[PDB]
Write a protein that binds this ligand. Structure first.
Ligand SMILES: *[C@@H]1O[C@H](CO)[C@@H](O[C@@H]2O[C@H](CO)[C@@H](O[C@@H]3O[C@H](CO)[C@@H](O)[C@H](O)[C@@H]3O)[C@H](O)[C@H]2NC(C)=O)[C@H](O)[C@H]1NC(C)=O
Ligand SMILES: CCCCC/C=C\C/C=C\CCCCCCCC(=O)O
Ligand SMILES: *[C@@H]1O[C@H](CO)[C@@H](O)[C@H](O)[C@H]1NC(C)=O
Lengths: 48, 48
């Protein structure tokens, strides 16, 4: 999903904001890997 | 010259406070921001 890097700490474990409560809440019982990736404009315009 | 306040025998609204603050990073152990919004503790000392 899309989320700015200015709120990368909202998805951190133990946070008390509205995203971790009502929106997507991560399950930690299985090996996860959260990745905050930035897709640049040229390659974004390439593949629609 | 930083200010310090101590709050005892008190109650507080987390949604009121977090409506004005864009949190960028929190690091801590022995407690979590979710725990501070749920549990009750003896005293609260704030420096800012
Ligand atoms: C502080 O926490 C309280 C709850 O612990 C939050 O109270 C709720 O605030 C919303 C508005 O921000 C209230 O909604 C309003 O309800 C009336 C009911 O008729 C409606 O007519 C209005 O159009 C509006 O929707 C809500 O009732 C209220 N809940 C309560 C008092 O139990 C409050 O939002 C928190 N403080 C801040 C600054 O967010
Ligand atoms: C950010 C609030 C600044 C002022 C807080 C001061 C006193 C209130 C006391 C306890 C509430 C715990 C703060 C919740 C932290 C949220 C962290 C995040 O959302 O990542
Ligand atoms: C330090 O902060 C206190 C708290 O408001 C203030 O009263 C005091 O004047 C300050 N001292 C300075 C700015 O030298």
């Amino acid at each position: 999903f899309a989320l700015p890097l200015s709120m990368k700490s909202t998805l951190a474990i133990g946070s008390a904001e509205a995203i971790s409560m009502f929106n997507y809440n991560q399950d930690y019982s299985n090996p996860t890997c959260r990745i905050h990736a930035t897709i640049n404009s040229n390659v974004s315009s390439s593949l629609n | 010259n930083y200010s310090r306040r101590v709050f005892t025998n008190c109650n507080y609204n987390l949604t009121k406070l977090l409506s004005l603050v864009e949190v960028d990073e929190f690091v801590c152990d022995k407690t979590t921001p979710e725990s501070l919004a749920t549990g009750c503790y003896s005293s609260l000392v704030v420096d800012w």
